[PDB]
Write a protein that holds these residues in place. Structure first.
Motif, PDB file in Angstrom:
ATOM      1  N   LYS A  84     -34.884  16.734   9.687  1.00  0.00           N
ATOM      2  CA  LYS A  84     -34.977  15.320   9.513  1.00  0.00           C
ATOM      3  C   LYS A  84     -36.201  14.999   8.465  1.00  0.00           C
ATOM      4  O   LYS A  84     -35.897  14.360   7.712  1.00  0.00           O
ATOM      5  CB  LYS A  84     -35.221  14.830  10.795  1.00  0.00           C
ATOM      6  N   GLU A 137     -35.196   9.354  15.589  1.00  0.00           N
ATOM      7  CA  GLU A 137     -33.813   9.154  16.343  1.00  0.00           C
ATOM      8  C   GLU A 137     -32.970  10.534  16.122  1.00  0.00           C
ATOM      9  O   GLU A 137     -32.745  10.944  15.025  1.00  0.00           O
ATOM     10  CB  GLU A 137     -33.181   7.996  16.151  1.00  0.00           C
ATOM     11  N   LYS A 174     -41.335  10.757  19.267  1.00  0.00           N
ATOM     12  CA  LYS A 174     -42.432  10.173  18.539  1.00  0.00           C
ATOM     13  C   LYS A 174     -43.374  11.137  17.642  1.00  0.00           C
ATOM     14  O   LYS A 174     -43.599  12.236  18.279  1.00  0.00           O
ATOM     15  CB  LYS A 174     -43.354   9.523  19.632  1.00  0.00           C
ATOM     16  N   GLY A 184     -32.198   8.941  25.684  1.00  0.00           N
ATOM     17  CA  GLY A 184     -33.239   7.845  25.504  1.00  0.00           C
ATOM     18  C   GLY A 184     -34.677   8.247  25.786  1.00  0.00           C
ATOM     19  O   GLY A 184     -35.649   7.566  25.619  1.00  0.00           O
ATOM     20  N   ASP A 198     -29.992  13.352  18.190  1.00  0.00           N
ATOM     21  CA  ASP A 198     -28.782  13.471  19.319  1.00  0.00           C
ATOM     22  C   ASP A 198     -28.609  14.776  19.404  1.00  0.00           C
ATOM     23  O   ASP A 198     -28.252  15.987  18.741  1.00  0.00           O
ATOM     24  CB  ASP A 198     -27.444  13.046  18.895  1.00  0.00           C
ATOM     25  N   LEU A 250     -28.269  10.833  22.888  1.00  0.00           N
ATOM     26  CA  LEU A 250     -29.358  10.325  21.844  1.00  0.00           C
ATOM     27  C   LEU A 250     -30.925  10.472  22.605  1.00  0.00           C
ATOM     28  O   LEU A 250     -30.838  10.155  23.873  1.00  0.00           O
ATOM     29  CB  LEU A 250     -28.980   8.954  21.222  1.00  0.00           C
ATOM     30  N   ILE A 251     -31.536  10.566  21.612  1.00  0.00           N
ATOM     31  CA  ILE A 251     -33.353  10.618  22.081  1.00  0.00           C
ATOM     32  C   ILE A 251     -33.986   9.991  21.043  1.00  0.00           C
ATOM     33  O   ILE A 251     -33.667   9.663  20.129  1.00  0.00           O
ATOM     34  CB  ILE A 251     -33.493  12.053  22.592  1.00  0.00           C
ATOM     35  N   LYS A 252     -35.201  10.227  21.143  1.00  0.00           N
ATOM     36  CA  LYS A 252     -36.242   9.496  20.561  1.00  0.00           C
ATOM     37  C   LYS A 252     -37.736  10.091  20.536  1.00  0.00           C
ATOM     38  O   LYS A 252     -38.328  10.233  21.522  1.00  0.00           O
ATOM     39  CB  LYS A 252     -36.773   8.016  20.965  1.00  0.00           C
ATOM     40  N   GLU A 299     -40.862   6.906  15.066  1.00  0.00           N
ATOM     41  CA  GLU A 299     -39.993   7.466  16.031  1.00  0.00           C
ATOM     42  C   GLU A 299     -38.716   8.192  15.175  1.00  0.00           C
ATOM     43  O   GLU A 299     -37.890   7.276  14.622  1.00  0.00           O
ATOM     44  CB  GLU A 299     -39.560   6.013  16.965  1.00  0.00           C
TER      45      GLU A 299
END
Length: 76
Positions: free
Chosen positions: A33, A14, A6, A64, A16, A2-4, A12
């Motif tokens: 998204k 989220e 910006k 992350g 994957d 998973l990542i984030k 933010e």
């Protein structure tokens, strides 16, 4: 992993993706998204614009990792 990502607004997002998933894949994920063309999006990491030819693995983007998304298009 998973990542984030910006957004230019500050939100933010989220997601994957796998280390093998090229930037083009990440961009496409962002579009689906929020609802914005990926070709216009820009993934910034380590003070270096991630090229569609590269991939998360190349940017050692682990689960992350904070990706800085920015707008990018022609016309100006």
């Amino acid at each position: 992993m998973l990542i984030k990502v910006k957004t230019l607004t500050g939100k933010e997002i989220e997601i994957d993706i796998e280390p093998t998933d090229k930037v083009e894949r990440i961009k496409e994920r962002v579009e689906e998204k929020e609802g914005i063309p990926p070709q216009q999006q820009r993934l910034i990491y380590s003070g270096k614009q991630m090229n569609d030819e590269k991939t998360a693995a190349d940017y050692k983007i682990l689960g992350g990792s904070v990706l800085h998304l920015v707008l990018a298009l022609r016309g100006g």
